[PDB]
Amino acid sequence: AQEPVKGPVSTKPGSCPIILIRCAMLNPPNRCLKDTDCPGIKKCCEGSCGMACFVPQ
């Protein structure tokens, strides 16, 4: 079946602002992941190594 709009950690949130590339090293820390804590119009994305608040376009 399809997905009920929301449910999981958002499969279609926003778009990352593009950063360097995608740091594929080990397991870095993250200030956000699913529980985006950005007050305004931001969205936890990937800033080339680690995730954080990034505007979803």
Curated annotation (Swiss-Prot):
SVP-1 clotting repeats: from-to residues: 1-12
This protein's GO CC annotations: cornified envelope; cytosol; extracellular matrix; extracellular region; extracellular space
Ranges of residues in domain WAP: 9-57
Gene Ontology molecular function terms on file: endopeptidase inhibitor activity; serine-type endopeptidase inhibitor activity; structural constituent of skin epidermis
Keywords, sorted A to Z: Disulfide bond, Protease inhibitor, Repeat, Secreted, Serine protease inhibitor, Signal
Top-rank taxon: Eukaryota
GO terms of biological process kind: antibacterial humoral response; copulation; innate immune response; peptide cross-linking
Compartment(s): Secreted
Cystine pairs: C16-C45, C23-C49, C32-C44, C38-C53
Function as written in the Swiss-Prot or TrEMBL entry: Neutrophil and pancreatic elastase-specific inhibitor of skin. It may prevent elastase-mediated tissue proteolysis. Has been shown to inhibit the alpha-4-beta-2/CHRNA2-CHRNB2 nicotinic acetylcholine receptor and to produce a weak inhibition on Kv11.1/KCNH2/ERG1 and on the transient receptor potential cation channel subfamily V member 1 (TRPV1).
Domains as described in the record: Consists of two domains: the transglutaminase substrate domain (cementoin moiety) and the elastase inhibitor domain. The transglutaminase substrate domain serves as an anchor to localize elafin covalently to specific sites on extracellular matrix proteins.
Stated name of the protein: Elafin
Lineage: Eukaryota, Metazoa, Chordata, Craniata, Vertebrata
